[PDB]
Amino acid sequence: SMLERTINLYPLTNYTFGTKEPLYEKDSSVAARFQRMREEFDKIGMRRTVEGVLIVHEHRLPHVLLLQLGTTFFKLPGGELNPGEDEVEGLKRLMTEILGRQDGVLQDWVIDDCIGNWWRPNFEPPQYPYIPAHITKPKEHKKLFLVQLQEKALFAVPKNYKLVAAPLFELYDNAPGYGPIISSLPQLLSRFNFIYN
Amino acid sequence: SMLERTINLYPLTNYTFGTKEPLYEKDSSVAARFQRMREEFDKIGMRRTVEGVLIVHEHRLPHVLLLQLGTTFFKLPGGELNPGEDEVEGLKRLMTEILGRQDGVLQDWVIDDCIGNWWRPNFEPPQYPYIPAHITKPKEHKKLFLVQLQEKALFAVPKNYKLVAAPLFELYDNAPGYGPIISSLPQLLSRFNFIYN
Numbered sequence A, B: 001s002m003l004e005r006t007i008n009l010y011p012l013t014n015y016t017f018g019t020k021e022p023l024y025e026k027d028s029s030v031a032a033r034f035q036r037m038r039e040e041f042d043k044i045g046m047r048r049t050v051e052g053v054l055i056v057h058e059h060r061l062p063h064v065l066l067l068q069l070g071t072t073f074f075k076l077p078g079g080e081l082n083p084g085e086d087e088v089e090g091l092k093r094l095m096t097e098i099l100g101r102q103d104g105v106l107q108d109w110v111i112d113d114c115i116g117n118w119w120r121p122n123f124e125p126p127q128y129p130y131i132p133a134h135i136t137k138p139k140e141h142k143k144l145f146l147v148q149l150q151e152k153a154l155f156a157v158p159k160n161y162k163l164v165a166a167p168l169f170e171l172y173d174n175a176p177g178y179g180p181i182i183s184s185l186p187q188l189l190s191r192f193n194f195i196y197n
């Protein structure tokens, strides 16, 4: 009856958060964001994005690491794949670009579990955990993965972002605060057997 | 990068829904339900419940089988474990009790995946996908499993219930209609690679 995946969690104090240069968004506004999505869709079709869920604990309470753009939006570490790029190799590349060290030592990213899929039917904000009715050409497909951290690590956070450890209760039923993907992480993580090391 | 579990789905017209005698609830009201939960907690501690998610398709659109008590509440097939009872053997027993055949031929239930965990902190309706802060003695633990159906089957539905195939869009963000567990099935199912046979 042990059908659950077992995942090792480590204290937040096991991890060192250094700083490095700002990492600027491609798009300077929502309007530019949807213009670029439309231009690239006509060239190379559906956008493929990947996002990593990194979990720690303090005193046996799990927390998800989120990246806050100044004091505005909360984001998962991740981003856009290149055409023909493998999903796992691409998430590892993107997580190195975002949290990789100034001294250029490699993190050992371990990615073994898909935890969800979201689809964007139009060049507009709405996203769903399925392809909606009558939609033959979705504009974006987003894939979420659970990233198993090592016991200790040094991460370099771009100076324009703050790394924040969010407890699950703060995410739960808070789409206004976090939107529909991050707010449903508590439900998506409930199947795992966490070990509090 | 194929980290997803692959699941075979079959058309709803592949399945025959017969009828059998009513199957009556132990508790004739919410108030009796929480009285029995309190009496049993003092004798044998935390209630352990198990629930099965059974998926079909029509024209390549997935649907979850729900059991409607007349025209009131929607339920997953499942129920309460006995003390010392294995979770998987118990869900198989409960699904036979509910949907098992009048002719007494065994269904071949295949249960290979946990899809979530919910906890009830008090003798009250609220349930969460984690144990809330300061709660040392939760009153109920509910475990959800994905049940892989065979290509064809005959199910006997108790005359007091109706079997309904709900498309995912109807569940999504509809807790008033379905409550917080069934309404989050779209998110919990998004990680699977469904084959539409």
Ligand SMILES: C[C@@]1(Cc2cn(-c3ccccc3)nn2)NC(=O)CC1=O
Pocket: A023, A024, A025, A026, A027, A067, A075, A076, A077, A078, A079, A080, A094, A098, A161
């Ligand atoms: C190509 C790339 C790479 C990229 C990802 N991020 C980022 C994502 C999460 C957290 C912090 C930073 N910043 N640039 N540039 C964009 O504007 C979107 C995108 O995918």
Ligand SMILES: C[C@@]1(Cc2cn(-c3ccccc3)nn2)NC(=O)CC1=O
Pocket: B023, B024, B025, B026, B027, B067, B075, B076, B077, B078, B079, B080, B094, B098, B161
């Ligand atoms: C012991 C038992 C068994 C049981 C389960 N169900 C049922 C569950 C889902 C759908 C249709 C029927 N009806 N009786 N009696 C109760 O009143 C709760 C319980 O667990």
Ligand SMILES: [Zn+2]
Pocket: A058, A059, A060
């Ligand atoms: Zn401690």
Ligand SMILES: [Zn+2]
Pocket: A141
């Ligand atoms: Zn897709």
Ligand SMILES: [Zn+2]
Pocket: B058, B059, B060
């Ligand atoms: Zn068809």
Ligand SMILES: [Zn+2]
Pocket: B141
């Ligand atoms: Zn428990």
